[PDB]
Write an enzyme that holds these catalytic residues in place. Sequence first.
Site, mmCIF file in Angstrom:
data_model
loop_
_atom_site.group_PDB
_atom_site.id
_atom_site.type_symbol
_atom_site.label_atom_id
_atom_site.label_comp_id
_atom_site.label_asym_id
_atom_site.label_seq_id
_atom_site.Cartn_x
_atom_site.Cartn_y
_atom_site.Cartn_z
ATOM 1 N N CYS A 108 0.873 -1.182 0.000
ATOM 2 C CA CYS A 108 0.000 0.000 0.000
ATOM 3 C C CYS A 108 0.896 1.214 0.000
ATOM 4 O O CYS A 108 1.473 1.580 1.041
ATOM 5 C CB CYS A 108 -0.944 0.013 1.178
ATOM 6 S SG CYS A 108 -2.028 1.409 1.236
ATOM 7 N N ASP A 109 1.025 1.826 -1.187
ATOM 8 C CA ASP A 109 2.090 2.797 -1.393
ATOM 9 C C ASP A 109 2.005 3.980 -0.383
ATOM 10 O O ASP A 109 3.012 4.358 0.165
ATOM 11 C CB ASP A 109 2.133 3.334 -2.833
ATOM 12 C CG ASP A 109 3.120 2.571 -3.718
ATOM 13 O OD1 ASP A 109 4.149 1.947 -3.229
ATOM 14 O OD2 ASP A 109 2.910 2.676 -4.946
ATOM 15 N N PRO A 110 0.836 4.540 -0.185
ATOM 16 C CA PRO A 110 0.722 5.687 0.708
ATOM 17 C C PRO A 110 0.531 5.329 2.205
ATOM 18 O O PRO A 110 0.199 6.203 2.989
ATOM 19 C CB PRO A 110 -0.469 6.438 0.161
ATOM 20 C CG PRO A 110 -1.251 5.458 -0.685
ATOM 21 C CD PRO A 110 -0.437 4.260 -0.883
#
Lengths: 784, 784
Positions: B470-472
Amino acid sequence: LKAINNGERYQLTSPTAMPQSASFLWNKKMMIQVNCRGYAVAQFMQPEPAKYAYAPNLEAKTFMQPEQPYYAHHPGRFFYIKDEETGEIFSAPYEPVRSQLNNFSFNAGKSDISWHIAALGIEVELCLSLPVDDVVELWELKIKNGGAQPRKLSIYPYFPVGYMSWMNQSGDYSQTAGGIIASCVTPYQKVADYFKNKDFKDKTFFLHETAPAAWEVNQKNFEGEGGLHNPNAIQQETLGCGNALYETPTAVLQYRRELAAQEQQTFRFIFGPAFDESEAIALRNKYLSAEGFAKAKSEYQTYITSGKGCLQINTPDPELNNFVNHWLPRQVFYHGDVNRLTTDPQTRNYIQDNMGMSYIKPNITRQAFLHALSQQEESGAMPDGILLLEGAELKYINQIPHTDHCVWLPVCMQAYLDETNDYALLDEIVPYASGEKRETVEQHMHHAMRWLLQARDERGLSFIAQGDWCDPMNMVGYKGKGVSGWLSVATAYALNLWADVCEQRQQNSCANEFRQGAKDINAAVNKHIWDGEWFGRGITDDGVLFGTSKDKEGRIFLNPQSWAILGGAADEQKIPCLLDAVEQQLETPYGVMMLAPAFTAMRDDVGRVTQKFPGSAENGSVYNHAAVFYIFSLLSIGESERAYKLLRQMLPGPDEADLLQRGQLPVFIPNYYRGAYYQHPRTAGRSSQLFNTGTVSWVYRCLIEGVFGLKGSPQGLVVQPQLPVAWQTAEAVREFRGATFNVSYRKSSDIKEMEIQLNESVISGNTISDITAGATYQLTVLLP
Amino acid sequence: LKAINNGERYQLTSPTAMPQSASFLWNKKMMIQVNCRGYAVAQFMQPEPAKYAYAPNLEAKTFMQPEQPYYAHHPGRFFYIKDEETGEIFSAPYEPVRSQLNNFSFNAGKSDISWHIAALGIEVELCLSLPVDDVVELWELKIKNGGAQPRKLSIYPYFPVGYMSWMNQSGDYSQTAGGIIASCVTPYQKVADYFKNKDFKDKTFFLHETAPAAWEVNQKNFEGEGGLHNPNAIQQETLGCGNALYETPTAVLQYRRELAAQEQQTFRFIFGPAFDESEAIALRNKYLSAEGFAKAKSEYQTYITSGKGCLQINTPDPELNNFVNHWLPRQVFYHGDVNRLTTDPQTRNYIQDNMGMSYIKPNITRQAFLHALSQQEESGAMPDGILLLEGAELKYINQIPHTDHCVWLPVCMQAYLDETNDYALLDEIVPYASGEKRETVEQHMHHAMRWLLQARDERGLSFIAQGDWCDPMNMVGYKGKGVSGWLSVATAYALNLWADVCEQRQQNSCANEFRQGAKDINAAVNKHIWDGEWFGRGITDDGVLFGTSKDKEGRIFLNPQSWAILGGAADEQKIPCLLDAVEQQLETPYGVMMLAPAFTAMRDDVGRVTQKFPGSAENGSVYNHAAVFYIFSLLSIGESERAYKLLRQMLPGPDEADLLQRGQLPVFIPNYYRGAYYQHPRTAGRSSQLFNTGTVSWVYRCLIEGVFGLKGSPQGLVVQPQLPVAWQTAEAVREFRGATFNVSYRKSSDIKEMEIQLNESVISGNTISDITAGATYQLTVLLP
Ligand SMILES: [Cl-]
Ligand SMILES: [Cl-]
């Protein structure tokens, strides 16, 4: 197109003849440029730049570009009016619908911007203004039924918020705030930016004093297939009261009114940024009423008045009078009072913008010298930018090493000392950027002048690094050997002015050191830069001298000429070569170009300046700030007619072709009018429309001290006018060291020399030296 | 809305019912998204991203946003048609004029995009395509007089170039190039960027095969007061042949034709970037002819064909058939063949996009493992991004430390090895990112698995740093203590898959080491992450476990569930808790949400994910890539009906309400459909319209190996279908290790167990193990 309201405003009566024309307003934290058709660009400080009205796409970080193009969905400030009996619509001010209007006025004001328009028998008034200290736009709409019968209308403010953010954007109607609140999260990725951005005003509000019938916050639903020309939401009877959920939000309200014959109604709104609903409501309570508007307007008038300056004129040129009296001082005042709304002004901007304040609020000038010099480096070198806030950083061009920064110090201080006589500033103690060393202003200045003498090569010419005054002249000296012709000659000027100050202060070794300095530099310039009919611009890292007659593009630059006149590299023999070279290659009907012919391709030993479009900005435009240094140079050698002609060319009009070609309202001087006059005549003279420019502090100085010739000295006021010969008489009122001087000038064939009378009796000499604060003196100046 | 041309295209017949719908094309160096109304977004590589058609303002560096808003002056591809007898006008495809049309078709094609429109009795055909290897758009216009009488027409391509640059922009007509050439200098300030930008394609061309009557290159003069709705230049008889001199340029041509009854004419153009006129002319000679178009089209068809993949299906669902057969393989192929047109793909993207290529061109997969592993760090850790070019750099999220990168290696390699049997890749020798150490692929993989075992805290849980998949999700572990629940369970999966490979290769200590590893991790997950009805998402730096029933937002995440099923943290007892929790809180009509309820405010021990708009992207959308990991998990435990239901939800239609709500053509799977289904039902299901997503390689894998159940093993082809029970019969054709398998599936009440026949005779077991390259086998699979 003309002045109205006793000079308070200037009115344009077509929306199409000059469609790029605009005016601006500002306050302590924001500025707005308003286009005549309804488009606007607004920026505020928080404490860095930000916007609340966004483009419909993801825009780059920027205020405005020169010759900014507008487009249909560009941010703007609009009111749609619908005849509920016929379905017919128009918009104020003109966009987005562009209907035929029966009447149109755009009024640039000193303290507001407003329009009067009419269509379908309905009379619309629109007024914008700002308070002094909060970020908020104060909007006043008046709608009048101008006919004999009642009329049913739907009235729709349209204040588009635009595409706020890819991460998060929305909007809804808030009954509690009393209007629309758009909301976003400014995009970022680094955890440090979360902490840095935490107090951003990521809401945009549009709040109503009067509760409306309906609203729409979804831009697409406002438009439907009708688009801005004929929005669907306006074709309906009532707006659908939609919201925006990760959709582009908008501010649209609807009022439905039946208006009696001659009846007028007034509606108030505020528009701006907020951290939260609570701040929007705080602003609402403070401003959104007849009383909040009135109190703000009167505080704002007082702010503008406090910056009115020191010179009112009455000449035979009514365009000059109006410009100088009503428009010039506010534009000077904007620059020094808010420093162009950057937390890192370029050093030369900080110094020159504040120089202008000498004639407006000299104590801000004084503070500016103290603040700048506290950031001087221990070597005596000045940084590229001045930081106005703890934590700010140098940005953009301020990160690219330029070398001219020290020059401005004595050049601009001279203006300060002549105007105020505050030699005592020189004894103020200030630190440096690093170290424990605290020294007087005067010792700082010495170290700046020594810095400029050390920063020179074996030939005695100033290193240019990645640029001097010409910001994008970046490849002359990027290898560490290239030198500037402009900086050399300007350094000699600086050294001469500062040597005078040292003499005035009994610092006689310094005075000698710096005068000798200036002689060495001028000798080196004369040996290596002088090109036979004019001074060249620099010598590249590989030893080539450019700005010479051998060059087909960039054959002559203005600046080395202006500044050789000032600093003394140009003698009596050279000066007439300069004048004729400048007139033949650089002068135009719109004023003097800074270089010519303009560059049409990269020249990579000069650099990025040469890739700008020919006749835009530093690539050979009528770049007004360069033009005014020439004007000033001309005045310093008594070239009165030349100086005045070129100064007057900065002001568009009254010639109609001139006005239409430049496409500007004469309520400010832009940073440039397009050059490359010989290469591209169709566009030449076009205004950049940019009101940010260090030009105006020098223009004001030239008028006060040069043209009108009312200049300060350690003895008092020196009368040394250089009026153009066409003027048979003129007047000026000069405020100076707390007194007023009502000056009448008159040409008289009965005399050989200028004669000056003070309160009717003749003086000898040209200095008024008995000056009492609060007094008014009558001066009569008779001229041959 | 439906398939046409035997599946080659898909046709939409309203410009307003689904106004955001689009399709894409790509080639080796560019991609273009084309909206149904005429708007388009094009990017090319040179070798970094760039554009040739710009917004009317200064836009940020970006390709597209999710749910991209279009606006009237958004870049686009248009043709105005004027009836010279009546002055009436319309535009193809629909914008900018938005007239009533008599006919409208938008055709998404595999190899082109095209429209057919009619108005005023004139029939317009528009076709776009690209060659395989050059950056250029190939445009074909056909105009037909559909009536009984002659007709006089003015025909105007309008290809707006936009605002190219504040430093320098222009444009003119070039008779020599045969069309319009806009030109700019990309803005910069640093001298190093001059050298870096020197070979940019800063010209945009629009070139005609057929010489036109006139042209216009100045956008404002094209529009006048009529704007895009009714441009002034089109109201005139002839275009005025203006240029653009530091004005916004445009590409407008005019053809004037009298057309006989039934007569059709064809006009060709090319549009794109060039370094100089010489390159534009090189492209003109190569492409701008009937023959250049034909050769390009046939080379392009061959390119798409070469990526057609390994599975054609014939089920009772005709929407699935069409999608799987015609659209899915091209979307997989795009990802691995050009790696999303970035020079630094995110590591997990590189690996997963290439995994997909196992089923298309497995040698590109193989090369991808070699290339990625050559950039492994000496510690065994993998970098955040893979560099595809000497000199490229990690950008954007790739600069923010994420920790999951190693996981993908055995997860995706498994697919490769099952499909191809290329265990011999494991013996290839590759370097590391630094040092002189060259080791086998297999030793690299071991060091990646050891890296993942070392990167864990005292509790045995994986560190999250500034994010995992989950990049952010950037503030769980930014202080260096936070851990991921998803990464823990995924690490155990990875370790188990890789231990199987080690066993298959007689690396038995390794197999034990990694199996023990996986047991330790799963124990720690069960002790610290399991929350009673589902697995939590992580434990913050300050020791709080989030993604639990105590949390009001972000109460359950999908991923820890999917991956606990796969990696074995979820046992037989836990699995039914997962299924019901996921179904009650996360399932929607548009598919499964990745988290819920969506976050509505910053939660700063989870981080930026929580500030995205609720139901957009990682903040609880139907994020298809997370959805497909769940699908895959469900298949791995025989949950056949659940898996198929959720997979089929990714494909919009045929239900009309569904189609209209999602607003997408069913020619690709987008990265997300809007979530927050319970919090914001009005928008839920809306497509992002983004075709870039790692979803499709997993969807393809799920179909091939899971649903249709035709999966490779070291013995051959394993038949293990999981068809939905509604299907009475189905067929598939499977290409596998150089052979073809014509498979018929049929439900039979005469049997207790699945029975498989090969070329009519019954086999025992479920593996076809005699496979000859070039042969075709008949498989009959009878099911209970
Ligand atoms: Cl210069
Ligand atoms: Cl997740």
